[PDB]
Coordinates of all heavy atoms in Angstrom, one line a residue:
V1 N 0.9 -1.2 0.0 CA 0.0 0.0 0.0 C 0.9 1.2 0.0 O 2.0 1.2 0.5 CB -1.0 0.0 1.3 CG1 -1.9 -1.2 1.1 CG2 -0.1 -0.1 2.5
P2 N 0.4 2.3 -0.6 CA 1.3 3.5 -0.6 C 1.1 4.4 0.7 O 0.0 4.4 1.2 CB 0.7 4.3 -1.8 CG -0.7 3.9 -1.9 CD -0.7 2.5 -1.5
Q3 N 2.2 5.0 1.2 CA 2.2 5.9 2.3 C 3.0 7.1 2.0 O 3.6 7.3 0.9 CB 2.8 5.1 3.5 CG 2.3 3.8 3.9 CD 2.9 2.6 3.0 OE1 3.7 2.9 2.2 NE2 2.6 1.4 3.5
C4 N 3.0 8.0 2.9 CA 4.0 9.2 2.8 C 5.0 9.1 3.9 O 4.7 8.9 5.1 CB 3.1 10.4 3.0 SG 1.6 10.6 2.0
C5 N 6.2 9.1 3.4 CA 7.4 9.0 4.3 C 8.1 10.3 4.2 O 8.6 10.7 3.2 CB 8.4 7.8 4.1 SG 9.0 7.8 2.4
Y6 N 8.4 11.0 5.4 CA 9.1 12.2 5.5 C 9.9 12.2 6.8 O 9.7 11.5 7.8 CB 8.1 13.4 5.6 CG 7.2 13.4 6.8 CD1 7.6 14.3 7.9 CD2 6.1 12.7 6.9 CE1 6.8 14.4 9.1 CE2 5.3 12.7 8.0 CZ 5.7 13.6 9.1 OH 4.9 13.7 10.2
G7 N 10.9 13.1 6.7 CA 11.8 13.2 7.9 C 13.2 13.6 7.5 O 13.4 14.1 6.3
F8 N 14.2 13.4 8.3 CA 15.6 13.8 8.0 C 16.1 13.1 6.8 O 16.8 13.6 5.9 CB 16.4 13.4 9.3 CG 17.9 13.8 9.0 CD1 18.4 15.0 9.1 CD2 18.8 12.8 8.7 CE1 19.8 15.3 9.0 CE2 20.1 13.0 8.5 CZ 20.7 14.3 8.6
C9 N 15.9 11.8 6.7 CA 16.4 11.0 5.6 C 15.9 11.4 4.3 O 16.6 11.5 3.2 CB 16.2 9.4 5.8 SG 17.0 8.7 7.2
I10 N 14.5 11.7 4.2 CA 14.0 12.1 3.0 C 14.4 13.4 2.6 O 14.7 13.8 1.4 CB 12.3 12.0 3.0 CG1 11.8 13.2 3.7 CG2 12.0 10.7 3.7 CD1 11.1 14.1 2.5
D11 N 14.6 14.4 3.6 CA 15.2 15.7 3.3 C 16.6 15.5 2.7 O 17.0 16.3 1.7 CB 15.2 16.5 4.6 CG 15.2 18.0 4.2 OD1 15.8 18.4 3.2 OD2 14.5 18.8 4.9
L12 N 17.5 14.7 3.4 CA 18.8 14.5 2.8 C 18.8 14.0 1.4 O 19.5 14.4 0.5 CB 19.6 13.6 3.7 CG 21.0 14.0 4.1 CD1 21.6 13.0 5.0 CD2 21.9 14.0 2.7
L13 N 17.9 13.0 1.1 CA 17.7 12.4 -0.3 C 17.3 13.4 -1.2 O 17.8 13.5 -2.3 CB 16.6 11.3 -0.2 CG 16.3 10.6 -1.5 CD1 17.7 10.1 -2.3 CD2 15.3 9.6 -1.4
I14 N 16.4 14.4 -0.9 CA 15.9 15.4 -1.7 C 17.0 16.4 -2.0 O 17.2 16.8 -3.2 CB 14.7 16.1 -1.2 CG1 13.4 15.3 -1.1 CG2 14.4 17.5 -1.8 CD1 12.2 15.9 -0.6
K15 N 17.8 16.8 -1.0 CA 19.0 17.6 -1.2 C 19.9 17.0 -2.1 O 20.5 17.7 -3.1 CB 19.6 18.0 0.1 CG 20.8 18.9 0.0 CD 20.4 20.2 -0.6 CE 21.6 21.2 -0.7 NZ 21.3 22.4 -1.3
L16 N 20.3 15.7 -1.9 CA 21.2 15.1 -2.9 C 20.8 15.0 -4.3 O 21.5 15.2 -5.2 CB 21.5 13.7 -2.3 CG 22.2 13.5 -0.9 CD1 22.6 12.0 -0.6 CD2 23.5 14.4 -1.0
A17 N 19.5 14.7 -4.4 CA 18.8 14.6 -5.8 C 18.8 16.0 -6.5 O 19.2 16.1 -7.7 CB 17.4 14.0 -5.7
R18 N 18.6 17.1 -5.7 CA 18.6 18.4 -6.2 C 20.1 18.8 -6.7 O 20.2 19.4 -7.7 CB 18.1 19.4 -5.2 CG 17.6 20.7 -5.8 CD 16.1 20.8 -6.1 NE 15.6 19.7 -6.9 CZ 14.4 19.4 -7.1 NH1 13.4 20.2 -6.6 NH2 14.1 18.4 -7.9
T19 N 21.1 18.4 -5.8 CA 22.5 18.7 -6.1 C 23.0 17.9 -7.4 O 23.7 18.5 -8.2 CB 23.3 18.5 -4.9 OG1 23.1 17.2 -4.5 CG2 23.0 19.5 -3.9
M20 N 22.6 16.6 -7.4 CA 23.1 15.8 -8.5 C 22.1 15.5 -9.6 O 22.4 14.6 -10.4 CB 23.5 14.5 -7.8 CG 24.6 14.5 -6.8 SD 26.2 15.0 -7.4 CE 26.3 16.7 -6.9
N21 N 21.0 16.2 -9.6 CA 20.0 16.1 -10.7 C 19.4 14.6 -10.7 O 19.3 14.1 -11.8 CB 20.6 16.5 -12.1 CG 21.0 18.0 -12.0 OD1 21.3 18.6 -11.0 ND2 21.2 18.7 -13.2
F22 N 19.3 14.1 -9.7 CA 18.8 12.7 -9.6 C 17.3 12.6 -9.6 O 16.6 13.6 -9.2 CB 19.3 12.0 -8.4 CG 20.8 11.6 -8.4 CD1 21.5 11.3 -7.3 CD2 21.4 11.6 -9.7 CE1 22.9 11.0 -7.4 CE2 22.7 11.2 -9.9 CZ 23.5 10.9 -8.7
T23 N 16.7 11.5 -9.9 CA 15.2 11.3 -9.9 C 15.0 10.0 -9.1 O 15.0 8.9 -9.6 CB 14.6 11.1 -11.3 OG1 15.3 10.0 -11.9 CG2 14.9 12.4 -12.1
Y24 N 14.9 10.2 -7.7 CA 14.8 9.1 -6.8 C 13.4 8.5 -6.8 O 12.4 9.1 -7.3 CB 15.1 9.6 -5.3 CG 14.2 10.6 -4.8 CD1 13.1 10.4 -4.1 CD2 14.6 12.0 -5.2 CE1 12.2 11.4 -3.7 CE2 13.7 13.0 -4.7 CZ 12.5 12.7 -4.0 OH 11.7 13.8 -3.5
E25 N 13.4 7.2 -6.3 CA 12.1 6.5 -6.0 C 12.2 5.8 -4.7 O 12.8 4.7 -4.6 CB 11.8 5.5 -7.2 CG 10.5 4.8 -7.1 CD 10.4 3.8 -8.3 OE1 11.2 3.8 -9.2 OE2 9.3 3.1 -8.3
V26 N 11.5 6.4 -3.7 CA 11.7 5.8 -2.3 C 10.9 4.6 -2.2 O 9.7 4.5 -2.6 CB 11.4 6.9 -1.3 CG1 9.9 7.4 -1.6 CG2 11.5 6.3 0.1
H27 N 11.4 3.6 -1.5 CA 10.7 2.3 -1.2 C 11.0 1.9 0.2 O 12.0 2.3 0.8 CB 11.3 1.2 -2.2 CG 10.5 -0.1 -2.0 ND1 11.1 -1.3 -1.8 CD2 9.2 -0.3 -2.1 CE1 10.2 -2.2 -1.7 NE2 9.0 -1.7 -1.9
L28 N 10.1 1.1 0.8 CA 10.2 0.6 2.2 C 10.7 -0.8 2.2 O 10.4 -1.6 1.2 CB 9.0 0.8 2.9 CG 8.7 2.1 3.6 CD1 8.6 3.2 2.5 CD2 7.4 2.1 4.5
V29 N 11.4 -1.2 3.2 CA 11.8 -2.6 3.4 C 10.6 -3.6 3.6 O 9.8 -3.3 4.5 CB 12.8 -2.7 4.6 CG1 13.4 -4.1 4.7 CG2 13.9 -1.6 4.5
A30 N 10.6 -4.6 2.7 CA 9.5 -5.5 2.8 C 9.6 -6.3 4.1 O 8.7 -6.6 4.8 CB 9.6 -6.4 1.6
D31 N 10.8 -6.7 4.5 CA 11.0 -7.5 5.7 C 10.9 -6.6 7.0 O 10.6 -7.0 8.1 CB 12.5 -8.1 5.8 CG 12.6 -9.2 6.8 OD1 11.6 -9.6 7.4 OD2 13.8 -9.5 7.1
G32 N 11.1 -5.2 6.8 CA 10.9 -4.3 8.0 C 12.1 -4.4 8.9 O 12.0 -4.0 10.1
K33 N 13.3 -4.8 8.5 CA 14.5 -5.0 9.3 C 15.7 -4.5 8.6 O 15.7 -4.5 7.3 CB 14.7 -6.4 9.8 CG 13.5 -7.0 10.6 CD 13.8 -8.5 11.0 CE 12.6 -9.1 11.7 NZ 11.4 -9.1 10.9
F34 N 16.7 -4.1 9.3 CA 17.9 -3.7 8.7 C 18.6 -4.8 7.9 O 19.1 -4.6 6.7 CB 18.9 -3.0 9.7 CG 18.4 -1.8 10.4 CD1 17.6 -1.9 11.4 CD2 18.7 -0.6 9.8 CE1 17.2 -0.7 12.0 CE2 18.3 0.5 10.4 CZ 17.4 0.5 11.5
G35 N 18.6 -6.0 8.5 CA 19.1 -7.2 7.8 C 20.6 -7.3 8.0 O 21.5 -6.5 7.6
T36 N 21.1 -8.6 8.5 CA 22.4 -8.9 8.6 C 22.6 -10.3 8.2 O 21.8 -10.9 7.6 CB 22.8 -8.6 10.1 OG1 22.0 -9.3 11.0 CG2 23.0 -7.2 10.4
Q37 N 23.8 -10.9 8.6 CA 24.0 -12.3 8.2 C 23.5 -13.2 9.3 O 24.0 -13.2 10.5 CB 25.6 -12.5 8.1 CG 26.2 -11.7 7.0 CD 27.7 -12.0 6.9 OE1 28.3 -12.4 7.8 NE2 28.3 -11.6 5.7
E38 N 22.4 -13.8 9.1 CA 21.7 -14.7 10.0 C 21.8 -16.2 9.6 O 21.7 -16.5 8.4 CB 20.2 -14.3 10.2 CG 19.4 -14.2 9.0 CD 18.0 -13.8 9.2 OE1 17.7 -13.5 10.4 OE2 17.2 -13.8 8.3
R39 N 21.7 -17.1 10.6 CA 21.8 -18.5 10.3 C 20.5 -19.0 9.9 O 19.5 -18.7 10.7 CB 22.5 -19.3 11.4 CG 23.7 -18.7 12.0 CD 24.4 -19.6 12.9 NE 25.0 -20.7 12.2 CZ 25.7 -21.7 12.7 NH1 26.0 -21.8 14.1 NH2 26.2 -22.7 12.0
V40 N 20.4 -19.8 8.9 CA 19.1 -20.4 8.5 C 19.4 -21.9 8.2 O 20.3 -22.5 8.6 CB 18.6 -19.8 7.1 CG1 18.4 -18.3 7.3 CG2 19.7 -20.0 6.0
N41 N 18.3 -22.5 7.7 CA 18.5 -24.0 7.3 C 19.7 -24.1 6.4 O 20.0 -23.3 5.5 CB 17.2 -24.5 6.6 CG 16.0 -24.4 7.4 OD1 15.0 -23.7 7.1 ND2 16.0 -25.0 8.6
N42 N 20.5 -25.2 6.6 CA 21.8 -25.3 6.1 C 22.7 -24.2 6.6 O 23.1 -23.4 5.8 CB 21.8 -25.5 4.5 CG 23.1 -25.8 4.0 OD1 24.0 -26.3 4.7 ND2 23.4 -25.4 2.6
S43 N 22.9 -24.2 7.8 CA 23.5 -23.1 8.5 C 24.9 -22.7 8.0 O 25.4 -21.6 8.2 CB 23.6 -23.3 10.0 OG 24.4 -24.5 10.3
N44 N 25.6 -23.7 7.3 CA 27.0 -23.3 6.7 C 26.7 -22.5 5.5 O 27.2 -23.0 4.3 CB 27.7 -24.7 6.5 CG 27.9 -25.5 7.8 OD1 27.2 -25.2 8.8 ND2 28.9 -26.3 7.7
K45 N 26.1 -21.4 5.6 CA 25.8 -20.5 4.5 C 25.5 -19.1 5.0 O 24.6 -18.9 5.8 CB 24.7 -21.0 3.6 CG 24.3 -20.2 2.4 CD 23.2 -20.8 1.6 CE 22.8 -19.9 0.4 NZ 21.7 -20.5 -0.3
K46 N 26.0 -18.1 4.5 CA 25.8 -16.6 4.7 C 24.9 -16.0 3.7 O 25.3 -16.0 2.5 CB 27.1 -15.9 5.0 CG 27.8 -16.2 6.3 CD 29.0 -15.5 6.5 CE 29.7 -15.8 7.7 NZ 31.0 -15.0 7.9

């Protein structure tokens, strides 16, 4: 579903796009986590 995301990060992204003439497309994490190397089935795998 679409939302509106605003804050420090989006302001920095807007500033960077304005300076570098970029056309950004903001997306949210589907997992909702930062994500690291976690052990799963067949744990001998990153």
